[PDB]
Design an enzyme around this catalytic site. Structure first.
Site, PDB file in Angstrom:
ATOM      1  N   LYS A 246      71.517  21.365 -43.951  1.00  0.00           N
ATOM      2  CA  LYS A 246      71.400  20.965 -42.538  1.00  0.00           C
ATOM      3  C   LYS A 246      70.174  20.173 -42.071  1.00  0.00           C
ATOM      4  O   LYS A 246      70.233  19.457 -41.083  1.00  0.00           O
ATOM      5  CB  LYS A 246      71.574  22.177 -41.622  1.00  0.00           C
ATOM      6  CG  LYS A 246      70.733  23.335 -41.973  1.00  0.00           C
ATOM      7  CD  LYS A 246      71.159  24.556 -41.207  1.00  0.00           C
ATOM      8  CE  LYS A 246      70.368  25.747 -41.706  1.00  0.00           C
ATOM      9  NZ  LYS A 246      70.775  27.012 -41.051  1.00  0.00           N
TER      10      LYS A 246
HETATM   11 CL   LIG Z   1      73.000  24.336 -45.081  1.00  0.00          CL
END
Ligand SMILES: [Cl-]
Ligand SMILES: Nc1ncnc2c1ncn2[C@@H]1O[C@H](COS(=O)(=O)NC(=O)[C@@H](N)CCC(=O)O)[C@@H](O)[C@H]1O
Ligand SMILES: [Mg+2]
Length: 468
Positions: A246
């Site tokens: 992320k």
């Molecule tokens: Cl992740």
RNA sequence: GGCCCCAUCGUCUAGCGGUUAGGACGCGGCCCUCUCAAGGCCGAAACGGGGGUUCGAUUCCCCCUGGGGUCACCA
């Protein structure tokens, strides 16, 4: 037959890696007229993120996948949530104890950290505890874990359908904890017990698990069960080749949906990550994917997830795969989220048609075509400059326009073409400033279609504020 | 660091002994044209290194390098 599954762990946003793996499991099951199962692996209470499970289940349905057995569709071998199968794992962990394939270890987290610092990894010291004393110390409620009693010395063979046989030296296999002191199982225990109990015969998961596979082969042996076939897929990567994450990439499926990516495209893109059609074709449906699927056409190197090609593909869908009407429907939520409104379906449709080749994400439509839905639109400095430079001839054209009765694209073009002729000037020198007056921009679709769109009154009512 | 997996353009890939090493994204140019796009055409761009095997390696085998995974009471 063939039973496959996706065993997501509810610990964060619906991971793209999850969609990627689920797609290959779905194809393989269908291609063999088999079953595709969804099993939620919520065995770690510390990392459990409430609300994750619904989000992952929604995301798989959004992408077009369907499952035959799972949390919200029922099934013969449920529950399909490991947290609801706790007693089940207890029973099997104790069964291993008796078979002599596991032992109870009472070390505290701190002692284990110390053993790891000295000998690096647990040394199996608890194996030297008389089985009777171990049992006795357990009845006293003394906290402990159950570990896999790996056969030392030795070798364990894992068969990967895509890479052949891989040999592991038991000294490379730790006496992994099977059951945690809180009574919850570890991934290793739950995975084998459940895959077996749910009939899975084809385990497809990413390559990050290959090295743990020998632990599973040994568990199947300890229980005296037959091992399923293993197919380890490559890991999706960040642009810097690291396992996708992320902080360096967008890994959340809800992010792609919120950004206006068509689920059909995101799906199509995810298929080209380690797989390719025979004829090299890259735009295809989920159904064609199932039909052409074959392990012979799966690539084993870790693919970089390229956001730009995803945008391109999304735009290809928006302009060549979906119908004008489907696009007009999928654009509404984004119009609403931008606070814009459309007069009618006919208007929207025509607006979408004019913009079809000018946006790659549904979120970009409200942005680039804002001037078609509201009077609250920005005017670029470049557009303002072109407006002032041509203010004179727009004033001379205005009356001709107010005089015009047939407000049609054809009519308007013949009118302006003639106006540029008589004024001895290129259409662009009159078309460009009119565009700025109407759109507040210099990058729009054809002038005649933009002029016609609003209707005579609306178009002129705006041309007037410009001349004012 | 030990163990395991992987290796063609910047990126996703085709190839599965002999090819001008092909396609796609992106990038550059041209055509189209009222702007911008879309579309069409053209172009630059790759077999990580060293050994072998073979008449012949991108392809088959070994080593090295690089990348990834794992060595958690995480998955
Ligand atoms: Cl992740
Ligand atoms: N970067 C990536 N690229 C490509 N695949 C990736 C991935 N990250 C995770 N995956 C794969 O997605 C599936 C679920 O991921 S997960 O939520 O973390 N859960 C688990 O890994 C374990 N619950 C299940 C393992 C198994 O299937 O046997 C698993 O199949 C997992 O291997
Ligand atoms: Mg070339």
């Amino acid at each position: 037959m063939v039973v496959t599954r996706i065993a997501p762990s509810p610990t964060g946003d619906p991971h793209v890696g999850t969609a990627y793996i689920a797609l290959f499991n779905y194809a393989w099951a269908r291609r063999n007229g088999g079953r595709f199962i969804v099993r939620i692996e919520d065995t770690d209470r510390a990392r459990y993120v409430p609300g994750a499970e619904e989000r992952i289940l929604a995301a798989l349905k959004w992408l077009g996948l369907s499952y035959d057995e799972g949390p919200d569709v029922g099934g013969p071998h449920g529950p399909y949530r490991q947290s609801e199968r706790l007693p089940l794992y207890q029973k099997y962990a104790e069964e291993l104890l008796k078979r002599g394939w596991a032992y109870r270890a009472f070390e505290t987290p701190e002692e284990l950290e110390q053993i790891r610092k000295e000998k690096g990894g647990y040394d199996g010291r608890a194996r030297n505890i008389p089985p009777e004393e171990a049992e006795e110390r357990a009845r006293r409620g003394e906290p402990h874990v159950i570990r896999l009693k790996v056969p030392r010395p030795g070798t364990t063979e894992v068969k990967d359908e895509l890479r052949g046989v891989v040999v592991y030296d038991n000294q490379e296999i730790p006496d992994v904890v099977l059951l945690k002191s809180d009574g919850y199982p570890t991934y290793h225990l739950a995975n084998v017990v459940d895959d077996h109990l749910m009939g899975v015969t084809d385990v497809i998961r990413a390559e990050e698990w290959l090295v743990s596979t020998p632990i599973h082969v040994l568990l199947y042996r300890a229980f005296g069960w037959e091992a399923p076939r293993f197919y380890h897929m490559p890991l999706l990567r960040n642009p810097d080749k690291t396992k996708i994450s992320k902080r360096k990439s967008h890994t959340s499926l809800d992010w792609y949906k919120a950004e206006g990516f068509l689920p059909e495209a995101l799906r199509n893109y995810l298929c080209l990550m380690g797989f390719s059609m025979p004829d090299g074709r890259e735009i295809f449906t989920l159904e064609e994917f199932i039909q052409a699927f074959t392990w012979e056409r799966v690539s084993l190197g870790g693919p970089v997830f390229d956001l730009e090609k995803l945008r391109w593909m999304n735009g290809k869908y928006i302009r060549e795969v979906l119908s004008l009407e489907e696009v007009a429907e999928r654009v509404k939520p984004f119009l609403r989220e931008a606070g814009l409104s459309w007069e009618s379906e006919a208007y929207l449709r025509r607006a979408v048609e004019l913009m079809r080749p000018r946006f790659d994400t549904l979120k970009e439509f409200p942005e680039k075509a804002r001037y078609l839905f509201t009077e609250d639109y920005p005017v670029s400095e470049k557009a303002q400059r072109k407006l002032e430079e041509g203010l004179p001839l727009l004033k001379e054209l205005y009356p001709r326009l107010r005089a015009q009765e047939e407000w049609t694209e054809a009519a308007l073009e013949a009118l302006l073409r003639g106006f540029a002729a008589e004024k001895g000037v290129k259409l662009g020198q009159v078309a460009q400033p009119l565009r700025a007056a109407l759109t507040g921009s210099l990058e729009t679709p054809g002038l005649f279609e933009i002029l016609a769109l609003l209707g005579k009154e609306r178009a002129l009512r705006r041309l007037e504020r410009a001349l004012a």
